[PDB]
Ligand binder design. Sequence first.
Ligand SMILES: [Mg+2]
Ligand SMILES: [Mg+2]
Ligand SMILES: [Mg+2]
Ligand SMILES: [Mg+2]
Ligand SMILES: [Mg+2]
Ligand SMILES: [Mg+2]
Ligand SMILES: [Mg+2]
Ligand SMILES: [Mg+2]
Ligand SMILES: [Mg+2]
Ligand SMILES: [Mg+2]
Ligand SMILES: [Mg+2]
Ligand SMILES: [Mg+2]
Ligand SMILES: [Mg+2]
Ligand SMILES: [Mg+2]
Ligand SMILES: [Mg+2]
Ligand SMILES: [Mg+2]
Ligand SMILES: [Mg+2]
Ligand SMILES: [Mg+2]
Ligand SMILES: [Mg+2]
Ligand SMILES: [Mg+2]
Ligand SMILES: [Mg+2]
Ligand SMILES: [Mg+2]
Ligand SMILES: [Mg+2]
Ligand SMILES: [Mg+2]
Ligand SMILES: [Mg+2]
Ligand SMILES: [Mg+2]
Ligand SMILES: [Mg+2]
Ligand SMILES: [Mg+2]
Ligand SMILES: [Mg+2]
Ligand SMILES: [Mg+2]
Ligand SMILES: [Mg+2]
Ligand SMILES: [Mg+2]
Ligand SMILES: [Mg+2]
Ligand SMILES: [Mg+2]
Ligand SMILES: [Mg+2]
Ligand SMILES: [Mg+2]
Ligand SMILES: [Mg+2]
Ligand SMILES: [Mg+2]
Ligand SMILES: [Mg+2]
Ligand SMILES: [Mg+2]
Ligand SMILES: [Mg+2]
Ligand SMILES: [Mg+2]
Lengths: 144, 67, 60, 185
Amino acid sequence: GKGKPRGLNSARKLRVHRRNNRWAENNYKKRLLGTAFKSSPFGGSSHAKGIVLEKLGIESKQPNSAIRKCVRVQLIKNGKKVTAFVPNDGCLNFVDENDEVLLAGFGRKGKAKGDIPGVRFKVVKVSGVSLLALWKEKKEKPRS
Amino acid sequence: SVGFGLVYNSVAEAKKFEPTYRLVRYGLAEKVEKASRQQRKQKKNRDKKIFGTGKRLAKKVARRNAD
Amino acid sequence: AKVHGSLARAGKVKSQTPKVEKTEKPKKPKGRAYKRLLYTRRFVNVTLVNGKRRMNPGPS
Amino acid sequence: PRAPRTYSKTYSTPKRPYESSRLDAELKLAGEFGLKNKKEIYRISFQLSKIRRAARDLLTRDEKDPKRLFEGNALIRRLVRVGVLSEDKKKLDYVLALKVEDFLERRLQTQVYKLGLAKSVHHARVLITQRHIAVGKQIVNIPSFMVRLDSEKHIDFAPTSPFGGARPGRVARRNAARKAEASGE
RNA sequence: GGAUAGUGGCCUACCAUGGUUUCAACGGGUAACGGGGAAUAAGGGUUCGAUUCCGGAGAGGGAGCCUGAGAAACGGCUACCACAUCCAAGGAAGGCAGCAGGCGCGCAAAUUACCCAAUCCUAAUUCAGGGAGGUAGUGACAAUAAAUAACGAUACAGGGCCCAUUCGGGUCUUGUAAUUGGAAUGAGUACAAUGUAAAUACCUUAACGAGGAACAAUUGGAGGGCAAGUCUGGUGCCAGCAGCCGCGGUAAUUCCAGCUCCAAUAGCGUAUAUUAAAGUUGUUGCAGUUAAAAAGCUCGUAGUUGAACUUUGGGCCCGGUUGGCCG
RNA sequence: GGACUUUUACUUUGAAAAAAUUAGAGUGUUCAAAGCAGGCGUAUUGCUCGAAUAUAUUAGCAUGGAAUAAUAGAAUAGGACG
RNA sequence: GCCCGUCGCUAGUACCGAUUGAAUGGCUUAGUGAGGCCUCAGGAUCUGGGA
Ligand SMILES: [Mg+2]
Ligand SMILES: [Mg+2]
Ligand SMILES: [Mg+2]
Ligand SMILES: [Mg+2]
Ligand SMILES: [Mg+2]
Ligand SMILES: [Mg+2]
Ligand SMILES: [Mg+2]
Ligand SMILES: [Mg+2]
Ligand SMILES: [Mg+2]
Ligand SMILES: [Mg+2]
Ligand SMILES: [Mg+2]
Ligand SMILES: [Mg+2]
Ligand SMILES: [Mg+2]
Ligand SMILES: [Mg+2]
Ligand SMILES: [Mg+2]
Ligand SMILES: [Mg+2]
Ligand SMILES: [Mg+2]
Ligand SMILES: [Mg+2]
Ligand SMILES: [Mg+2]
Ligand SMILES: [Mg+2]
Ligand SMILES: [Mg+2]
Ligand SMILES: [Mg+2]
Ligand SMILES: [Mg+2]
Ligand SMILES: [Mg+2]
Ligand SMILES: [Mg+2]
Ligand SMILES: [Mg+2]
Ligand SMILES: [Mg+2]
Ligand SMILES: [Mg+2]
Ligand SMILES: [Mg+2]
Ligand SMILES: [Mg+2]
Ligand SMILES: [Mg+2]
Ligand SMILES: [Mg+2]
Ligand SMILES: [Mg+2]
Ligand SMILES: [Mg+2]
Ligand SMILES: [Mg+2]
Ligand SMILES: [Mg+2]
Ligand SMILES: [Mg+2]
Ligand SMILES: [Mg+2]
Ligand SMILES: [Mg+2]
Ligand SMILES: [Mg+2]
Ligand SMILES: [Mg+2]
Ligand SMILES: [Mg+2]
């Protein structure tokens, strides 16, 4: 009756087979190959702090017409160069080149967000403070 | 309020079986105060760099005051 | 796609929406008292039942 | 390098976050026993959950199996003790029933109200936290005290505070100060 | 035989040709110390365990060794390598993966404070010493309890209800209120006592300490999933939002705000990881004609699997543990 | 004490077994997370209950079972008892 | 209506690639070899053959 062995001694084949096939799991493979630590701009860690190289004006994908304000960031522990979105209305006004920023993921498991092409990170903080506070008014940008 | 009490057969028997911080609280033993704990430790260590008495090292260092 | 589109207009809309200050209003009770208000509002007195029930209506 | 301090959390949050039938059902309880949290209900549902799990397990064992008899009987008399399990229904297929509300109607905040003494659960809360009402001469300021049957007869105001002799109180006495310092000398 | 505390290719002589392997040796990887354990809750599982206890290893890297019952010891020595400090240039000296503290690193982690009072350890020892350990500081890691208000009066309005030929309000309270009314309490502050090694806090408790200017709750959302507006103003495929589907090109139910409303609430969002959802890893328990998938075909070794049949039936005792009807 | 014994798997009961964790009993830490306390009087010379139980699975040990599934047996008789 | 490929623009990722390219870490041949230990000696001095 189709498939798999049934027998009482066929434990090994049953484990091996599973082992072999577990590899078709997209997440398992990433874990065991250590893809994270190897590819992927962050270490495999949740956030990464980097430095702002240029400010970009990414044009959004269809069916959306817009200009998504972004930044090129060179992760400090890394040299890895990355582009990141600057969330909310204005906020790009807060950043400036050579400034220090804190990058996070986009909540999509790698993968880019919406109509923003090739962007897999967003900012979060600048010069030690946080976009959110700045955008509101709770905090002010530091001197230099 | 709930505590704990002791009562010795004599004033000589408390003074010997009592913790010394307690007799202090009472007024039947003075708080013999000393230097800091790390003042003391340092003195122990300074003292480690000397072998023997010390005054032998007073006179010999006193000759340097000629050279 | 394109990468170097204008940045001149960053924060266009927020910067041009007219400020209207928040109004000064009754202090809402916090804690258990708020759960109270909710319950007398939602179940004890009742307001309307225009067929069904509404929580945030205006001009109906 | 010292014995770990053991802890446990004491509540559980519902899976479906926004189910209005459950949300109505929860609020009604909140306003019926003078609670302040969805957690104060989340808590009890957790207490229940295990009591039920416990009971379920025992039921699968043989009628008059040693463990069943020992821990089942024990669970019941604990439940009977506080007044969640009625006397008649006293053999665990009913604890297997039970209900959140049964547990609620035994809080001190509610028992203080249930026989007079407060009239409105909210007065009953405020009274409890503000150091009036006690069990023995032992003041109790936790609304969740869970009156155990045999202390029920002893829920009365404290020998301290007004309401139980002792003293009027510093806001009243302050008025007795402006009374004879205006109209006197 | 030598060596060792002692068995042993441990080492050396002689002699032989053995030892392991598809039941996966050997080799590689490990962002690998092992375990007790942790997370996740139908069950079967899956993921994790540097880290309070047990075992092992190490003290910048290597090796060597003295002492000694015990070390191949590093808050011991010796050499080399890396690093590194003082100098009068001749020389000398260092090893925080102890406690604290600094640099660096980074997303990522606290005081250069007090004490041996407790817990216990060591010594020649009741006594000395113990950054073991305890105390406090820092501390929204996690966990527990649960304040931000409670009660009356009045002023119209209600719905109850007896009557209704028809005024209506009158007493059982449902409460929305722009004047009202006395009550209560710890947050805090603070004699004192308790606490404690001494302190600080908690537990106690004199004097103070609540009416909206507080002693003033937040964090997110309000098109669907998904609990809550088709309100007003703004912008006009811009700015922005949107995990996913999707909104925005002039009456935007998604943007920017006001108002109002929802959910969890001393907490709530975001990012990353994992677990449940997942019978999308399937032993339980998947799927394979056409959706992803039966090797072109047959032989075949390892591996898995493999028809039926051999003391069954009858007889007699022995003593138990529940349950019925009596007690 | 002597003389000899075909091999296993499975299952049962038990021993040997760290604590903390976990499940769980007892006990009103004011409640509770915890803790392992505590409770009674002559509260003026003391009386007293505790500090359980469960789990602990693979392997090794020990005991019972003889279904299921393997092993071995006498055919060039070099068979079996005495 | 749908729709295929070369060709052209911007941006991103990986691949091949002269450089017998570079880097870190683990083992290791051969050569050189510190140091303590063991051992053949030695004998400043200092005893009664020994230290
Ligand atoms: Mg494939
Ligand atoms: Mg689309
Ligand atoms: Mg660029
Ligand atoms: Mg690095
Ligand atoms: Mg000292
Ligand atoms: Mg000395
Ligand atoms: Mg040999
Ligand atoms: Mg040779
Ligand atoms: Mg050979
Ligand atoms: Mg294999
Ligand atoms: Mg490692
Ligand atoms: Mg470990
Ligand atoms: Mg591990
Ligand atoms: Mg590590
Ligand atoms: Mg060592
Ligand atoms: Mg180091
Ligand atoms: Mg080396
Ligand atoms: Mg060493
Ligand atoms: Mg050491
Ligand atoms: Mg000189
Ligand atoms: Mg240190
Ligand atoms: Mg050190
Ligand atoms: Mg932190
Ligand atoms: Mg002496
Ligand atoms: Mg001492
Ligand atoms: Mg210390
Ligand atoms: Mg406040
Ligand atoms: Mg106020
Ligand atoms: Mg808000
Ligand atoms: Mg809805
Ligand atoms: Mg408009
Ligand atoms: Mg609008
Ligand atoms: Mg809005
Ligand atoms: Mg939540
Ligand atoms: Mg099965
Ligand atoms: Mg499938
Ligand atoms: Mg197909
Ligand atoms: Mg075929
Ligand atoms: Mg083949
Ligand atoms: Mg068969
Ligand atoms: Mg067993
Ligand atoms: Mg135990």
